[PDB]
Design a protein around this ligand. Structure first.
Ligand code: HEM
Lengths: 135, 90
């Protein structure tokens, strides 16, 4: 990940990411339609009983990215570490982990029409492709 | 030439869309062949739904550029997919 790629994302998230945490509920739904296979199971969030747990998780994701992004420089595994927690202890297939962030992006596209430039999508896209450990 | 404004536009996009594809790396987790298409598919459905704001002119030729854009993106999209479907069997 280049230092340019670091200044890009840092700002890319500044513009587009203020409300990211409110689109929790949405993206999950968007991931179920775009990738039907991600729904056949999905033991999480106790969905049948309400969008409570899933809307909250939304915030947890947006806060996670806000921080992991604000620290691309010094905490490069910030996100990789998170992926590990999900895959190993929260029993959440890392495929889902990946897609859901994709949908978060697609979901942001829907709400911020003109501010979510293709460039901004790229910056973020890159950052999100930083899921494997760095040494 | 549907116009000019929509000529430097359609070209800037096919550009930014290229940086997206070229900056792509095939690390784990590897998403199934099928799912990948859906993503690229979702990427285009993004650009178009975006440039469909930058485009100008009359809603008659306005929706011609877009239809040409989607046509062009696929031009770069297809190489990428083949490039990936090749990584699968690889
Ligand atoms: C963009 C990707 C994602 C990010 C950044 C993210 C981030 C987070 C964060 C920061 C937490 C809180 C972790 C902690 O307790 O320290 C969390 C919890 C959790 N995440 Fe995710 N997550 C993502 C995707 C997913 C996906 C796709 C699923 C489901 C398959 C999922 C399921 C869960 C569950 C079940 C919890 C526990 C929630 C709870 O405390 O009730 N996450 N996630």
């Amino acid at each position: 990940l280049s230092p340019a790629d670091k200044t890009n994302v840092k700002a890319a998230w500044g513009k587009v990411g203020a409300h990211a945490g409110e689109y929790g509920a949405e993206a999950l739904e968007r991931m179920f339609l775009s990738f039907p296979t991600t729904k056949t199971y999905f033991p999480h969030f106790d969905l049948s009983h309400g969008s409570a747990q899933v809307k909250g998780h939304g915030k947890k994701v947006a806060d996670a990215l806000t921080n992991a992004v604000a620290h691309v420089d010094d905490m490069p595994n910030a996100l990789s570490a998170l992926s590990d927690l999900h895959a190993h202890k929260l029993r959440v297939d890392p495929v889902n982990f990946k897609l859901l962030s994709h949908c978060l992006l697609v979901t942001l596209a829907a709400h911020l029409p003109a501010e979510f430039t293709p460039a901004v999508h790229a910056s973020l896209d890159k950052f999100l492709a930083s899921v494997s450990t760095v040494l | 030439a549907l116009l000019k404004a929509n000529k430097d536009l359609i070209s800037a996009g096919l550009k930014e869309f290229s940086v997206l594809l070229n900056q792509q790396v095939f690390n784990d987790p590897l998403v199934s062949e099928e799912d990948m298409v859906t993503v690229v598919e979702d990427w285009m459905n993004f650009y178009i739904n975006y440039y469909r704001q930058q485009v100008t002119g009359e809603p008659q030729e306005r929706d011609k550029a877009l239809q040409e854009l989607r046509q062009e993106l696929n031009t770069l999209a297809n190489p990428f997919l083949a490039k990936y479907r090749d990584f699968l069997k690889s």
